[PDB]
């Protein structure tokens, strides 16, 4: 899946062509087209736990907004080929918009009727066989928290209830015609794992930045490479968890275990439960790994370097400013705001021009 | 809610869904890893009394067409897939995967761990199965059924695929804008072939029409005798399933051929029978060779073919007679892929040269024999 | 199907409910109810041929309005559930808005999948086997001459040449358990014709007025009873042609024949075909027949009584004009025009103010 | 494209399309003007070795569902109909029609002027025709079959349908809510009720048992004195297929019974016996009755109910011993529909009571049965 970054280009054109725009990329590998590909909606880093809804159901203008979204694709148009469905479009109609073989079509068509039904029968209706039918096609325990109206965690508790996990499988080359002694995995629901984790050494885990957009790039690459590398040399089995295809961070020879993964709580902790990692490392992959860090100590990760909530010192503006002023060192006229009347009251005082940070 | 399981010698289950017809199927099990190529595959001959396990997790997404099929009918005893596709979609489909497979009364079973297999298969070697598509498949039935299988190791079955009475063949390969097209006209075929039908593929013959030759085909059990009183331009051995040792018949009539001088042309099933006319031993893989990206050397002259292979049976080198010499040789694993006569005009590859499906980088193997039918007419 | 006037009453609520609001009412017969639906449809009278189209396939907004008026049915709502379909909506849409069984809606969706291969394959395609299949889900000449983008005649032209025409049937009470000497009937595409034509006596076709409406309402069932009554007591056989099941003219016992038919074009073409009557009346049921009268004569029909083109001469505003100068007769200051501002320069002269009559 | 065609022994041919399994199908062909209960008919036994055809255009449209079984199978010999709808729309539906009629083997013909062939038979009577669908139905082999069609006139049927041995029954009626109950415990069911098997509908069994019976079924060919030997509170006779005539055994065994004083009841074919066993006469109908909406007069009451029909036989007024007194005459034809016995305790009905489908008005024949048990138990 392509990453674009529209947003920060407001007077353009948005509308995708035959002259590229998008600024990176994310892949995923599933068993099925289903899951490979709700895997790689969740892995793009934009926000989605798969297909998330862009427009309101009881929106009468809906159905023409759609239309307009399928039959002059921007970089949203996955996500509103599933509103198509949602809204009562058919198949055959959207594929006259779009032009995307119905062999697709109807596979995300029938993602959505999925959703409704776990809409319907709520958590209490996701019993094993329906849970596992949904892992199975590539459901994040976040979209189905949404449509049921619960937490993420509480799906993945009640997984680990179920005693439902993904198996690992290996990139080979060869579809299993030969072994391989390489770890190159990615993860599924089915019967066998092919992960068999080292008991042997003390590992440490390192998050990868996803898809490269604008203002995150190759440099956090370079950084987790080199952390790779550099604790490889000192003996630490390293595991690399990423999904940017043009990075030399997903090249199998960059660390000793490779997880082609989204870079996800979810996606994360799996790995983490079978590797059971000295540590893992969350501040050298970008914005993505740095917000999933509360997360993942909540979680029971062993998280090194700069804490989660040292990270949160500075990562928070209201923190930081606190901290600065601990510390007796200078900053400009500044206030802490959440809402536009405080913010504009706030604003008279402090003083213009101003710079608007979140 | 349909069910279906598969159950391997070893006791291994897959549960799954049933996509084909109701019942059991047994036979044995092996691994195939074309990517395209399904119908041909199922409708190949080479497969009777196999249970076929395709890597690939999607199998159905073109629908079938008869263009697509290899012989009469599905020969494959049974399907095991990863997932069956919502529906087909192709151009050239008339018949969804599954409607087909019920068609033609096949026990199919699809939403298991191919892989799994896959990988058990690769490592434990063949194993033969049994399938069981419906209410409450039994385990345990299927179990001893797999159990109770003979096994392909010595059973023949160019014999049970056979055509019953002899016959002529006269259409060429397929063609995107053609399509299948009509049947050439005796006179149209300057040469003459005699083809042995141990199980043969259309393609092969297709694609033996496309070179100008006029084909008879004939059954397997086919007298030398009979065969010669024809004055073939040169002849034919056929692919086909099972065990070509217990093949004697066909051994015995080919050493005969040997003894004259007409260009003699083997593939597959036809490349074994013509090493064991020549003295050469036969050896069942550990899990054969099945799939469409196959590397073989042309040691002649070093080059690489990307090749069809489905073969469960193999010619030892080591046990090679002088007379005959290694023309190609698996870049995979190094078994023996072709051979030709010192001494007399004839050759066989292990490969399938005609493809169907797959790569048609083994084709010129053909211009190869119609160059040898050609200096026998010569003469 | 019902009747309605909603454009007579502009600022009226036109949304359907558990008032009446409608004026009158059409009922058709069919073997099935494609057949019958379809009938019904052309025999209402608002302009029809079946499912003409309400909106356009190239309008941006067009499943808004779709939307909308399948949420809250109007007199319109038949036409736009076929638009629907045209759009890309799935029946499961549809019944969502509708709540109009699905038994009934996959009818319709499958008379619009014909409706398209038409639009594909032209009047070339239109082979006597598709042409049958066309006519047996009622589809009228004239819809498919839209379609195929050629004249009604030459749709008809085309069922002569390959002997497709109707059959009659007979209502009967009993599903045909028992004979009946009553001549009912109704047309239907089949094997069997039930219509048993006199060959002994001169004929008189009567044509019926449609469904009531505001300005031709049961004045014209009155005297088209009349006019058999009357024929009848003199000697002829009087056969009514007329699909108004509220009318004592739609009773058996008050023609000799009558033939519970749509009255159109194609429709009475048909019987005429078969009946071969002396002769046609179009002057006592409204506005219908009085339209027909030119196109009947023009094909053959004996028309009774005030002729076509005296029809045209009354019923033409510049012809009737033109009479009344002749004749120097007293008529107000007018002008009879086509277009806006030639009318606009006309007003100018004539004065206002000034009556608009079509 | 699916072909059908149904051929009637006068040569009359009507082509169509094949809506049900593929092969050929052979019988007396009736007519049914039923617009409701088409699952109900073709699950009914009386119409076994018959062709149904169904007045109403559409058939199918609620698909259907195992409650809608009057016995344990499709008994039609085939199915003839004008329009199979796209969809089956009901709540209650397992199975849309042609699934079902696939499913059964069921040969299946649709697109047919359904009209035509109705007039054809009430204006000729009843025909024997052959319905062959599949890729090229041969007209002239359907007409050979069809003219081979030997005639339900003398033929015994109830013995080809009657059950193996004996059982019982304590089931009731179905309910919207409940569904199809749960069967009682014979401790729940005061009288006891042995009924002869000659094909019988299930809704009578069920009605009956509605009514306080415990029931006990029958073969055909019981003997009276096997019967009497359980000591039953009354007696029933079912409804079946083929000449009534014929099933001397039954006749004979009915005899038996008309000695004792045990109330007997008989439901149209069960009807036409009893009116056997008491000396009367039976004719074979021109088209005979089939439908749901046949007005019968209750002479006595002179009050008149709509009713289930479905037979091609019928009982001569103008033979009827004197023993014999008619209860019920058909409007529609004045036809003999009821009858009573003036000495013994034994009446009958020439149409269904117990309905299914169709209307309830004549339910209350049953009724008349359980006062004439109750009343042989006070005895
Ligand atoms: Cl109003
Ligand atoms: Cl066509
Ligand atoms: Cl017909
Ligand atoms: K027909």
Same mark, same amino acid.
């Given at each position: 899946?392509?990453?674009?970054?529209?947003?920060?280009?407001?007077?353009?054109?948005?509308?995708?062509?035959?002259?590229?725009?998008? *600024?990176?990329?994310?892949?995923? @590998?599933?068993?099925?087209?289903?899951?490979?590909?709700?895997?790689?909606?969740?892995?793009?880093?934009?926000?989605?736990?798969?297909?998330?809804?862009?427009?309101?159901?009881?929106?009468?203008?809906?159905?023409?907004?759609?239309?307009?979204?399928?039959?002059?694709?921007?970089?949203?148009? &996955?996500?509103?080929?599933?509103?198509?469905?949602?809204?009562?479009?058919?198949?055959?109609?959207?594929?006259?918009?779009?032009? &995307?073989?119905?062999?697709?079509?109807?596979?995300?068509?029938?993602?959505?009727?999925?959703?409704?039904?776990?809409?319907? *029968?709520?958590?209490?209706?996701?019993?094993?066989?329906?849970?596992?039918?949904?892992?199975?096609?590539?459901?994040?325990?976040?979209?189905?928290?949404?449509?049921?109206?619960?937490?993420?965690?509480? @799906?993945?508790?009640?997984?680990?209830?179920?005693?439902?996990?993904?198996?690992?499988?290996?990139?080979?080359?060869? +579809?299993?015609?030969?072994?391989?002694?390489? +770890?190159?995995?990615?993860?599924?629901?089915?019967?066998?794992?092919?992960?068999?984790?080292?008991?042997?050494?003390?590992?440490?885990?390192?998050?990868?930045?996803?898809?490269?957009?604008?203002?995150?790039?190759?440099?956090?690459?370079?950084?987790?490479?080199? +952390?790779?590398?550099?604790?490889?040399?000192?003996?630490?089995?390293?595991?690399?968890?990423?999904?940017?295809?043009?990075?030399?961070?997903?090249?199998?020879?960059?660390?000793?275990?490779?997880?082609?993964?989204?870079?996800?709580?979810?996606?994360?902790?799996?790995?983490?439960? @079978?590797?059971?990692?000295?540590?893992?490392?969350?501040?050298?992959?970008?914005?993505?790994?740095?917000?999933?860090?509360?997360?993942?100590?909540?979680?029971?990760?062993? *998280?090194?370097?700069?804490?989660?909530?040292?990270?949160?010192?500075?990562?928070?503006?209201?923190?930081?400013?606190?901290?600065?002023?601990?510390?007796?060192?200078?900053?400009?006229?500044?206030?802490?705001?959440?809402?536009?009347?405080?913010?504009?009251?706030?604003?008279?005082? @402090?003083?213009?021009?101003?710079?608007?940070?979140? | 809610?349909?069910?279906?399981?598969?159950?391997?010698?070893?006791?291994?289950?897959?549960?799954?869904?049933?996509?084909?017809?109701?019942?059991?199927?047994?036979?044995?099990?092996?691994?195939?890893?074309?990517?395209?190529?399904?119908?041909?595959?199922?409708?190949?001959?080479?497969?009777?009394?196999?249970?076929?396990?395709?890597?690939?997790?999607?199998?159905? =997404?073109?629908?079938?067409?008869?263009?697509?099929?290899?012989?009469?009918?599905?020969?494959?005893?049974?399907?095991?897939?990863?997932?069956?596709? /919502? !529906?087909?979609?192709?151009?050239?489909?008339?018949?969804?995967?599954?409607?087909?497979?019920?068609?033609? =009364?096949?026990?199919?079973?699809?939403?298991?761990?191919?892989?799994?297999?896959?990988?058990?298969?690769?490592?434990?070697?063949?194993?033969?199965?049994?399938? !069981? #598509?419906?209410?409450?498949?039994?385990?345990?039935?299927?179990?001893?059924?797999?159990?109770?299988?003979?096994? /392909? =190791?010595?059973?023949?079955?160019? $014999?049970?695929?056979?055509? #019953?009475?002899?016959?002529? %063949?006269?259409?060429?390969? %397929?063609?995107?804008?053609?399509?299948?097209?009509?049947?050439?006209?005796?006179?149209?075929?300057?040469?003459?072939?005699?083809?042995?039908?141990?199980? #043969?593929?259309?393609?092969?013959?297709?694609?033996?029409?496309?070179?100008?030759?006029?084909?008879?085909?004939?059954?397997?059990?086919?007298?030398?005798?009979?065969?010669?009183?024809?004055?073939?331009?040169?002849?034919?051995?056929?692919?086909?399933?099972?065990?070509?040792?217990?093949?004697?018949?066909?051994?015995?009539?080919?050493?005969?051929?040997?003894?004259?001088?007409?260009?003699?042309?083997? !593939?597959?099933?036809?490349?074994?029978?013509?090493?064991?006319?020549?003295?050469?031993?036969?050896?069942?893989? $550990?899990?054969?060779?099945?799939?469409?990206?196959?590397?073989?050397?042309?040691?002649? $002259?070093?080059?690489?073919?990307?090749?069809?292979?489905?073969?469960?049976?193999?010619?030892?080198?080591?046990?090679?007679?002088?007379?005959?010499?290694?023309?190609?040789?698996?870049?995979?694993?190094?078994?023996?892929?072709?051979?030709?006569?010192?001494?007399?005009? #004839?050759?066989?590859?292990?490969?399938?040269?005609?493809?169907?499906?797959?790569?048609?980088?083994?084709?010129?193997?053909?211009?190869?024999? !119609?160059?040898?039918?050609?200096?026998?007419?010569?003469?």
């Amino acid at each position: 899946i392509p990453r674009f970054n529209f947003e920060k280009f407001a007077g353009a054109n948005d509308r995708l062509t035959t002259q590229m725009k998008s *600024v990176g990329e994310v892949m995923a @590998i599933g068993r099925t087209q289903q899951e490979s590909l709700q895997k790689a909606l969740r892995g793009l880093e934009v926000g989605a736990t798969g297909f998330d809804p862009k427009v309101s159901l009881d929106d009468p203008e809906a159905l023409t907004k759609i239309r307009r979204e399928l039959k002059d694709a921007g970089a949203d148009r &996955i996500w509103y080929i599933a509103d198509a469905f949602r809204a009562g479009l058919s198949v055959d109609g959207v594929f006259n918009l779009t032009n &995307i073989d119905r062999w697709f079509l109807v596979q995300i068509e029938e993602l959505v009727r999925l959703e409704e039904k776990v809409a319907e *029968v709520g958590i209490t209706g996701l019993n094993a066989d329906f849970l596992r039918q949904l892992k199975r096609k590539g459901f994040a325990d976040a979209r189905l928290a949404k449509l049921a109206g619960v937490r993420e965690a509480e @799906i993945r508790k009640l997984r680990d209830q179920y005693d439902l996990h993904p198996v690992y499988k290996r990139v080979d080359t060869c +579809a299993a015609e030969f072994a391989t002694d390489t +770890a190159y995995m990615y993860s599924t629901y089915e019967e066998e794992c092919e992960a068999n984790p080292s008991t042997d050494r003390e590992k440490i885990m390192v998050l990868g930045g996803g898809p490269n957009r604008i203002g995150q790039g190759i440099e956090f690459d370079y950084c987790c490479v080199h +952390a790779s590398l550099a604790l490889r040399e000192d003996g630490y089995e390293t595991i690399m968890v990423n999904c940017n295809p043009e990075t030399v961070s997903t090249d199998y020879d960059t660390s000793d275990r490779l997880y082609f993964e989204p870079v996800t709580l979810e996606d994360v902790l799996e790995i983490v439960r @079978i590797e059971k990692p000295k540590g893992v490392i969350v501040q050298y992959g970008g914005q993505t790994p740095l917000k999933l860090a509360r997360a993942l100590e909540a979680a029971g990760v062993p *998280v090194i370097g700069t804490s989660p909530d040292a990270i949160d010192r500075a990562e928070d503006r209201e923190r930081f400013q606190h901290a600065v002023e601990r510390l007796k060192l200078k900053q400009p006229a500044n206030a802490t705001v959440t809402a536009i009347e405080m913010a504009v009251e706030k604003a008279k005082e @402090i003083g213009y021009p101003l710079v608007v940070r979140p | 809610i349909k069910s279906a399981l598969l159950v391997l010698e070893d006791g291994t289950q897959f549960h799954g869904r049933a996509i084909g017809a109701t019942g059991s199927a047994v036979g044995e099990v092996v691994f195939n890893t074309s990517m395209t190529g399904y119908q041909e595959i199922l409708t190949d001959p080479s497969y009777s009394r196999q249970i076929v396990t395709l890597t690939y997790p999607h199998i159905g =997404n073109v629908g079938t067409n008869d263009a697509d099929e290899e012989s009469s009918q599905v020969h494959a005893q049974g399907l095991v897939i990863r997932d069956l596709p /919502l !529906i087909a979609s192709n151009f050239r489909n008339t018949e969804d995967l599954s409607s087909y497979l019920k068609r033609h =009364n096949i026990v199919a079973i699809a939403d298991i761990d191919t892989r799994k297999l896959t990988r058990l298969l690769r490592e434990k070697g063949a194993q033969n199965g049994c399938i !069981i #598509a419906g209410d409450n498949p039994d385990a345990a039935l299927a179990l001893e059924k797999a159990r109770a299988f003979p096994g /392909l =190791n010595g059973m023949d079955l160019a $014999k049970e695929v056979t055509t #019953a009475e002899a016959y002529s %063949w006269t259409q060429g390969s %397929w063609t995107l804008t053609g399509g299948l097209p009509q049947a050439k006209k005796e006179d149209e075929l300057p040469f003459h072939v005699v083809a042995y039908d141990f199980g #043969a593929k259309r393609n092969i013959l297709r694609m033996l029409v496309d070179r100008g030759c006029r084909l008879t085909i004939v059954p397997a059990q086919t007298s030398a005798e009979d065969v010669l009183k024809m004055n073939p331009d040169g002849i034919f051995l056929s692919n086909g399933p099972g065990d070509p040792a217990p093949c004697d018949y066909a051994i015995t009539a080919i050493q005969k051929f040997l003894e004259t001088d007409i260009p003699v042309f083997g !593939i597959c099933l036809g490349h074994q029978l013509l090493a064991l006319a020549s003295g050469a031993k036969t050896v069942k893989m $550990k899990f054969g060779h099945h799939g469409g990206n196959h590397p073989v050397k042309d040691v002649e $002259k070093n080059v690489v073919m990307i090749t069809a292979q489905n073969h469960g049976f193999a010619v030892d080198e080591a046990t090679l007679p002088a007379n005959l010499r290694v023309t190609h040789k698996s870049l995979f694993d190094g078994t023996l892929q072709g051979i030709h006569r010192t001494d007399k005009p #004839a050759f066989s590859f292990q490969g399938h040269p005609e493809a169907s499906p797959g790569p048609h980088d083994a084709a010129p193997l053909f211009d190869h024999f !119609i160059e040898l039918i050609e200096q026998y007419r010569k003469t």
